[PDB]
């Protein structure tokens, strides 16, 4: 009926404590935003 209600932080996964990696990833667009949106939708779907 339900699987693990997981969520992944795109920025922390792609880049660690380093900031320059975060800045360089920021130019790839809204990949991380929609990526987190998909997992949030999955989590709410599991609760539903």
């Amino acid at each position: 009926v339900s699987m693990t209600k997981t969520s992944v932080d795109c920025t922390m996964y792609i880049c660690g404590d380093s900031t320059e990696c975060s800045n360089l990833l920021l130019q790839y667009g809204s990949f991380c935003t929609q990526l987190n949106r998909a997992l949030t939708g999955i989590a709410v779907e599991q609760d539903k």
Partner: protein
């Protein structure tokens, strides 16, 4: 965006009237307080004695 949590929610939602619910705005991280380095006792002492 950085004024208050509701303002961060407004920035994340890109709206001025956030509806009733729970919204994830940012990620909390604990920056390390200090750095400690530990090494074992050195035995390769120069033969000064």
């Amino acid at each position: 965006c950085a004024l208050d949590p509701l303002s961060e929610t407004k920035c994340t939602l890109k709206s001025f009237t956030v509806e009733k619910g729970i919204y994830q705005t940012s990620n909390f991280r604990v920056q390390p307080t200090e750095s400690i380095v530990r090494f074992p006792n050195i035995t390769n002492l120069c033969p000064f004695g």
